[PDB]
């Protein structure tokens, strides 16, 4: 699976040399195998692409005088920023992620675990939000690591009944969840991958919320457990957004219609009854 | 006291070389001095025991075609994983921990602070769960780091009132808490070491739960603060489980009883 | 803006060589350029100031025999610790922070973002507490990173509506929040920078609490969202504390009056 950095280095390296700003790691070396690289000393964006290893390597770079001429993504990137935004679609462990969407390591691990089908565009997920699935709940044991003691036949028995379990432990026998576009998810939020298949477009998940069921489009959910406090817009307004899908507009189209995006009232007058 | 890695190496190294997968740190080099170690390049389990420094290094190692012949614990381990599961009973800062039981740094720190008496077998604690004790609440101040300014005279009367406080600030004057076997603790959960002395066997603690009270065996508790939602099993089943104690079974009898472990109804017909 | 380390070295280094304990990073090498430094081998507090890079490095250092003659802050410090306590008033991204006050990376970021005006003395903030502001809620979109696509003119009208917004998205058009002295903030707590301007002196914010409005002095708030459960003291006691301000006492005054700090009744009798 290509990392975020590999996907960008593909796009933008264009025959340049990779300049590693920071102490390299094993994961970074494996990612830099197809490319030629050296430690960063003097760097010129015309000959070098700067890879900061950690986020603290990046702010050291950005506080250096040579960062003056480097553009984000085009000329530099952070390796330890797998959830960082990009202005184009990318793949996070083969999970599609739309433009201008970012998240933290709890969501990265969820993509790796297969819990996520897709993440949409213009979606903002706090770095401490978490997504996990339930263990089996209708067996004599609740442990998962006990399966490290199962031989092949016991494991087979065990896997057979996990797949028939209608509560979807470890997200078995359910569709991976789709996180919509223009979604907001707050700090320390939790989403149960065993019971959630959908976070609708425009949904807001407040800080500390424990999400155990699907979140309808443009609903605001808070609490432990999370419940709908309100919707961002009227039911007539939501139907309109889901039809227009401004999050699919081009960059040109976004700027030319910024008004309708800044003013929900004007959006409704223009696109409601067309 | 001995770190998790040292207990594993003493048991499984078997005269091999330690092959370090990742950038070695000061703490790792100190723990590796009694042994022979080198940076990992080409490794074979007949001659090398692979130690991944960070969990980032481990996933890179498991991505290497060389890792296929390496079995967990017996042939490789992560150093930045003091709470990671082991197939044998271990110690975590003088705290007994059962087989196939894992937890995060929040719980490792709790063992180091003396908050935990023991942790059972086959217990699953999410990495973000926290265990902490309360600051003092019967004083003019709640700060703890103000004591960095206390001389020994002030330190003495401060320590004095703490240990008499019936609300057990910093878990003073109370027994450390036992965490049972087959326990599940969810993400961002919190357990108050001032007020909790037992998490019973089989208890489930939900994500985001704030646990201020002992949790009975096989109770499911959720919420802020945590309340008992339901129990996993009937009363008679719970008694049977507390008598049978399948979590003390050997590896073979766990496999022999996989049908009873999978189906609670078959468990009762057999053992009830 | 000076890092925490820079502020400590300026105050305590006193012509000694900086001895680096751990793998040095790019950020650290830059911070150490105005000073003479080398990798730590053998160290003597008479001639060396030890800088541990990570908290892991510091654990190794304090377990080494060479450390037992070293005093915290005066002779050693961790570089990976901008939220760590200091015995003197410091700045964190030009936010004033009182003595013996500590917090985690979530609060360091809030200082960097401009969400915090000041943090008082002897205040204890758990490492998993978080402080953030709201996105705009009066527009068709909630995203913030859409503005990366806004051309020059679209950016202008976007920022103009942000500034006139009474719910203060991104903490616009509001005062940064003041966190008081003798404050306690628990694990996984959250404070909303868009609606909160004051955490009063002596306030207690429980574990898991979601704080959406101002916390009065010496109030105890818990829950999701946080609600006032009780106050630490009587109203007249609270007014006396806010007038006396023991948290600004000198070190000598704290030790001389330790019995009043340990006994609330003695405090009220002496200062009420
Ligand atoms: C992408 C990133 O990195 S995000 C960075 C970190 N930022 C955050 O976590 C911000 C989280 N924001 C929130 O939680 C906000 O409250 C949001 C998104 C729900 C917006 O709140 P707004 O509605 O202003 O809140 P306002 O108080 O009107 O809300 C009204 C009701 O919702 C409740 N509410 C709001 N948030 C929560 C919450 N997180 N938990 C419980 N209740 C909440 C309020 O208490 C209030 O209840 P009351 O009138 O019902 O008694
Ligand atoms: C060690 C690790 O691997 S941790 C990995 C990280 N994973 C997690 O943290 C997931 C944690 N999981 C949980 O918290 C689960 O939801 C568990 C185990 C309690 C689930 O219990 P279940 O039996 O599925 O409950 P089921 O969904 O029917 O719902 C029961 C009730 O509990 C509520 N509930 C479930 N979990 C929570 C929770 N975490 N907080 C509040 N309420 C909860 C449900 O809303 C429902 O309420 P109701 O019955 O009042 O309507
Ligand atoms: C760096 C650090 O700060 S270390 C962090 C690790 N430790 C923590 O975060 C522990 C934080 N401490 C707490 O949460 C404590 O409960 C405190 C200090 C906030 C208050 O505890 P106390 O004053 O002893 O309250 P005591 O348990 O009687 O409970 C009083 C009421 O508050 C409620 N309560 C206590 N804690 C919480 C909580 N965390 N969340 C919601 N309610 C709570 C109790 O349920 C009780 O309710 P009741 O009146 O209905 O019975």
B124, B246, B254 ranked by CB distance to A145: nearest: B124
Instruction: Name the residue with tokens 């610790």.
Output: C81
d(CA B121, CA A143) in angstroms, rounded, equals: 9
Tokens 């978080």 sit on residue: C130
Nearest-by-Cβ selection for A124 from C138, C145, C150: C145
Report whether B43 contacts B66 (CB < 8 A). Answer: yes
Q: Is B230 annotated as a binding residue?
A: yes
User: What distance separates the 2 farthest-apart alpha carbons in chain C?
Assistant: 65
**What is the DSSP secondary structure assignment for residue C77, as one 8-state letter?**
E
Q: Return the structure tokens found at C238.
A: 């609270």
Q: How far apart are CA B104 and CA B130, in angstroms?
A: 8
| Closest listed residue to residue B220, CA positions, set B239, B236, B242, B238 | B238
Listing DSSP states for chain B in one string gives ---HHHHHHHHH-TTPEEEEES---HHHHHHHTTS-EEE-SS--TTTEEEEESSHHHHHHHHHSGGGGGPPBTTTEEESS-TT---SS-EESSS-EE-TT-B--HHHHHHHHTT-EEEE-SS-EE-TT-EEE-PPPSSSS---SGGGGG--HHHHHHHHHHHHH-TT-GGGTTSPPEEE-SS-EE-TT-EEETTT--EE-TT-EE-TT-EE-S-B-TTEEEETTTTEEEEESS-HHHHHHHHHH-GGG--HHHHHHTHHHHH-HHHHHHHH-
Q: How many Cα atoms occupy the beta-carbon half-sphere of A212 within 13 Å?
A: 12
Residues 6+ apart with CB under 8 A from B265: none
Burial class from Cβ neighbours inside 10 Å (0-12, 13-18, 19+) for residue A22 reads buried
**Residue B241 and residue B29: Cα distance in Å, rounded?**
45
Assess contact for B179 and B116: CB atoms under 8 A: yes
* The Cα angle at residue A21 between residues A19 and A23, in degrees rounded to 5: 115
- Cβ contacts of B25 on chain C, cutoff 8 Å: 22-23, 54, 56-57, 60
End-to-end alpha-carbon separation of chain C, Å?
Answer: 41
Q: Tell me the pairing of strands A37-39 and C204-205.
A: unpaired
- Chain A hits for C140, Cβ within 8 Å: 241, 246, 260-264, 267
Tokens standing for residue C199: 């955490």
Nearest CA-CA distance, residue C98 and chain B, Å = 11
Q: Quote the strand ranges of chain C, DSSP E.
A: 17-21, 37-39, 48-52, 76-78, 90-91, 96-97, 116-119, 124-125, 130-132, 177-179, 184-185, 190-192, 198-199, 204-205, 210-211, 219-222, 227-231
B49 is in an annotated binding site: no
Handedness of CA B36, B40, B44, B50 (dihedral sign): positive
Beta-bridge partner residues of A19: A38, A50
CA atoms within 13 A on the CB side of B155: 7
d(CA C23, CA C39): 9
Contacts with C28 from chain A: Cβ below 8 Å: none
CA distance C1 to C92: 8
Task: Specify which residues C48 forms β-bridges with.
Answer: C17
> Burial, A253: exposed, middle or buried (Cβ in 10 Å; 0-12, 13-18, 19+)?
exposed
| Cβ-proximal residues to C177 (8 Å cutoff; 6+ apart), any chain | C115, C116, C117, C131, C191, C193, C196, C197, C198, C199
Q: How far apart are alpha carbons B137 and C230 in whole angstroms? A: 12
3-state secondary structure B16-42: CEEEEECCCCHHHHHHHCCCCEEECCC
From A21, A188, A260, residue closest to C188, measured CB to CB: A188
| Best probe residue, ligand 1, of A229, A230, A231, A232 (max atoms within 8 Å of C-beta) | A229
Phi, psi of A251 (to 5 degrees): -60, -45
CA B206 to ligand 2 center in whole angstroms: 5
Which tokens is C38 given?
A: 């080398």
Written as six digits, the tokens of B163 are 């240990």
- The alpha carbon of residue B91 is apart from the nearest alpha carbon of chain C, in Å, by 19
> What resolution in angstroms does the PDB record give?
2.3
Phi, psi for residue B77 in degrees, rounded to 5: -160, 160
Q: Which of B100, B106, B205, B206 to mutate to test the pocket of ligand 2 (most atoms within 8 A of CB)?
A: B206
Chain CA centroid to CA B111, Å:
8
B207 pocket-lining for ligand 2 (C-beta < 6 Å): yes
**CA A39/CA A20 separation, integer angstroms:** 5
Find chains touching chain C: ≥3 CB pairs under 8 Å. A, B
C-beta separation of A201 from A248 below 8 A? no
**Count of residues in chain C:** 272
Which among A201, A204, A181 has a CA at the least distance from the CA of C134? A204
CB-side neighbour CA atoms (13 Å) of B253: 7
Beta partners for C191? C131, C211
Residues of B in Cβ contact (< 8 Å) with C99: 149
**How far apart are alpha carbons A94 and B41 in whole angstroms?**
29
Give the count of beta carbons closer than 10 Å to the beta carbon of residue B230: 11
Collapsing DSSP to helix, strand or coil, A48 comes out as: strand
* Long-range contacts at B65-72 (CB < 8 A, ≥ 24 apart): B66/B42, B69/B44, B69/B45, B70/B43, B70/B45, B71/B45, B72/A148
Q: Which atom of ligand 3 is nearest to the CA of C204?
A: 19
3-state class (DSSP) for residue A85: coil
Compute CA distances B48 → A25, A181, B60, B264, C15, whole Å.
21, 48, 17, 43, 47
């Amino acid at each position: 699976m290509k990392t975020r950095l590999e996907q960008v280095l593909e796009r933008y390296l264009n025959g340049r040399e990779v300049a590693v700003w920071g102490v390299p790691t094993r994961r970074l070396l494996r990612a830099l195998k197809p490319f030629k690289f050296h430690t960063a000393d003097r760097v010129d964006p015309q000959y070098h692409y700067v890879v900061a290893v950690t986020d603290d390597d990046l702010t050291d770079f950005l506080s250096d005088e040579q960062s003056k001429s480097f553009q984000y993504a085009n000329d530099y990137l952070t390796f330890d920023d797998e959830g960082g935004e990009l202005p184009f679609e990318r793949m996070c462990f083969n999970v599609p992620v739309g433009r201008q969407t970012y998240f933290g390591d709890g969501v990265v691990g969820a993509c790796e675990n297969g819990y996520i089908k897709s993440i949409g565009q213009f979606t903002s997920i706090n770095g401490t939000a978490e997504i996990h699935a339930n263990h089996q709940l209708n067996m004599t044991f609740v442990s998962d690591d006990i399966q490290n003691f199962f031989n092949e036949e016991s494991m087979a028995v065990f896997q057979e009944k996990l797949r028939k379990d209608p509560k979807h432990p470890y997200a078995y026998s359910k569709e991976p969840m789709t996180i919509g576009s223009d979604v907001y998810i707050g700090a320390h939020a939790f989403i149960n991958a065993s019971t959630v298949t959908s976070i609708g477009d425009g949904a807001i998940i407040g800080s500390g919320a424990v999400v155990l069921e699907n979140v309808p489009p443009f609903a605001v959910v808070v609490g432990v457990p999370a419940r709908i406090k309100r919707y961002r817009f009227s039911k007539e307004m939501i139907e309109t957004l889901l039809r227009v899908k401004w999050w699919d507009w081009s960059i040109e189209e976004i700027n030319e219609n910024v008004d309708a995006l800044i003013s929900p009232e004007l959006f409704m007058k223009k696109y409601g009854s067309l």
